[PDB]
Paper text:
The earliest intermediate is the huge 90S pre-ribosome or small-subunit processome (SSU) that is co-transcriptionally assembled in the nucleolus by incorporation of several modular subcomplexes onto the nascent pre-rRNA. The UTP-A complex is presumably the earliest complex that associates with the nascent 35S rRNA and binds to the 5'-end of the 5'-ETS up to the binding site for the U3 3'-hinge. Utp4 is positioned in the center of the UTP-A complex and scaffolds large parts of the 5'-ETS. The UTP-A subunits have been shown to be essential for biogenesis of both the 40S and 60S subunit and have been linked to pre-rRNA transcription and are hence also termed t-UTP proteins.
The crystal structure of Utp4 was solved at a resolution of 2.15 Å by the single wavelength anomalous dispersion (SAD) method using seleno-methionine labelled protein. Utp4 comprises two 7-bladed β-propellers (numbered 1 to 14) with four strands (A, B, C and D) per blade. The overall architecture reveals the two propellers to be arranged in an orthogonal manner with the side of the N-terminal β-propeller 1 packing with β-strand 1D against the top of the C-terminal β-propeller 2. The first loop between β-strands 2A and 2B of β-propeller 1 forms an extended β-hairpin that packs against an α-helix presented by the opposing loop that emanates from β-strands 10D and 11A of β-propeller 2. A long Chaetomium thermophilum specific C-terminal insertion between β-strands 13C and 13D (residues 717–825) is not resolved in the crystal structure. Most prominent, residues at the very N-terminus constituting the first β-strand form a basic surface patch, which is also conserved. For Utp4 we observe an uncommon Velcro-closure for the most C-terminal blade 14 of β-propeller 2. While the N-terminal β-propeller 1 forms a continuous domain (residues 38–381), blade 14 is completed by parallel β-augmentation of the very N-terminus of Utp4 (β-strand 14C) and the N-terminal TEV cleavage site (anti-parallel β-strand 14D) introduced during cloning. In particular, a network of salt-bridges between conserved residues (R5-E864, R7-E864) help in stabilising the Velcro-closure suggesting a highly specific arrangement. We thus postulate, that the articifial β-strand from the TEV sequence present in our crystallized Utp4 construct mimics the physiological Velcro-closure in trans by Utp8.
Author numbering: -10 to 141, 148 to 226, 233 to 398, 415 to 578, 610 to 717, 824 to 843, 855 to 868
Amino acid sequence: TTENLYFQGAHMDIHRCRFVRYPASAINAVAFTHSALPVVSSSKKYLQKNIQVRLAIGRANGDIEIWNPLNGGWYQEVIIPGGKDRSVDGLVWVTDPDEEMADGKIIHGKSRLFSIGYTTTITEWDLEKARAKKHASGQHGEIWCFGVQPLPAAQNRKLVAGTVDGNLVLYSIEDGDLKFQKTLTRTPSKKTKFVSIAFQSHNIVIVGCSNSTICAYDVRTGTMLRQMTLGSKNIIVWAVKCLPNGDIVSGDSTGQVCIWDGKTYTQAQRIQSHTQDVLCLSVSADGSKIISGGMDRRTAVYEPMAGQSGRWSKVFHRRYHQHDVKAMASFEGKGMSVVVSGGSDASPIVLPLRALGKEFHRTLPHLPQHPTVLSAPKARYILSWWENEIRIWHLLNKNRKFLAQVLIKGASHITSASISEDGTLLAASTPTDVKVFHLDPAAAQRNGQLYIKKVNMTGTGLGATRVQISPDKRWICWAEEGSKVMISRVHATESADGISYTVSVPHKLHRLRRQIPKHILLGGLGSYDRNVSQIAFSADSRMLSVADLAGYIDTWVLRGPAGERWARNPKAAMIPKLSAAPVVLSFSPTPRDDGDYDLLVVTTLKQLLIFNPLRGMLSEWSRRNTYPKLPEPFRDTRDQVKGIVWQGQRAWFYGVASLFMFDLSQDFSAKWWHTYQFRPIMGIVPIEGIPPLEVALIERPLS
């Protein structure tokens, strides 16, 4: 339960905590913005720099996570919240062709994301607002599968969905909308389910069924062109894919992977590859590799049989996951060649397509990139949240006490929370609300927990994606729908009762306009990367900074004489743009002699930078201690930093499986230290009782 680190005078006293039962949600769906990018040479590499490849991961709890593959440094960027009685069962990206403007500038095709969730509704997601963009339903059964019709027209794209009562339905996503368009087919039997879908060409849809059949349908007419029969009369074809040559690969409930000739629609081959249901398939872009995953937890790899034309041989199988393999998808481009699989064990697993089965796979964290753990250091509270409940514990100065379970009502999960250092002011957000609470350690209920008082806060009803209370408890800053920065004054009133809190109406804080060419803004993910990932106050609560995924840092200063106002930091525009997304944004608590601040940043590329924001520039320390001088273990981009803990002028940085300590009063060339003994880390948070440091280190192992 306890550990103690000592590095050349610095003591860290650790409470090793495993009692925060952060739940794992199964991965049900995996999908890339692009399956494949065109091959280009080093001379033409710069023609793909502005293409934005993202991975979407859909969870059983309805969460949708946007990941950036970052040439192997996988980084979880944004989590769009699910909600009570919501689940994601399928994901589809629709990415337009690139388009050349009259002046020869390339607009990279825009990417739109849709999902289905065991209902009659298809949902399109607003990546720019991290919330639902539109819902569309029709009179048909629950949708069990869907896909986008491939291009042969390009300005009038179509989705085809199969339902549980055996209907193909067509949805139009024309001119940026989403609506039910037409029912194509009604199977004779309402017990026949359409469970998997793939396109063989623009007009021919392949559908796996629950009645031991695979059917080919013409998209224009709805006519059944070909029926393929398997085997029982209840063989479920959970997965169908088409090879580049038009051949069909199927995976079914009996554990078989079958190959069907694309022209005759006859069974060319049967491979008894799994011992339980085959749930998912993946095919490489060149059609030379097939991947399958099953309820038997195994992943299998197939390659073309030497000599024999159009037939396949199983190369190997291996258990990568701890539970079933529910979904997988491949990406090939910019030197990357991977398949990503997922299942009930909640970890995404990345296999390198060019070196399968050689122990080069990677298991990505099952814990969110955001720590999702907080402390109130002066109160010795530790806090976490998931779904729609906040849990609060007290580490006694029977060293544990469960203080409160705060319920946040809403159709969606909590997106963010913040607590004051003394544990009396608590804030939490959803996409529809920003909620504020007043905590009194003397206010108890019969169930033993704290009595939590609501603090009135009026708002736009657009909620927030991140929320942050200032250290002096006078301000609450949040990011509304990712891109808009808001701030409210927290008014404390004293009386015989003690303190009572009220909150002002939100005030808008304006970020700098950035110079981004119109061909970049109009393509790919639009303004998705302006999503604010960090909000940071300085220790004196007189400066405020935010940074977004694109790497822009905005700064405000508090002007004294409610005679106070937040104003634009005069030298804000001089702060450079980061070349990679910030994972940490933190004001050093140590005052500077020149009255400026040390604003520290860590990026996904493991850059470590300190800016002096009032002067508007990189600090002298950063000018000496550049990237090549950082310790080689720290520069490993497979080790993503999640958080920071200050110890005076020493800074501690942790990832999911790593802990570093740098003495920032010193220059690099040893005076830096690290350890890998802690894993898997949710977060490390200080508590109060060379200054020694006392922290709660929260680990959340699954297996």
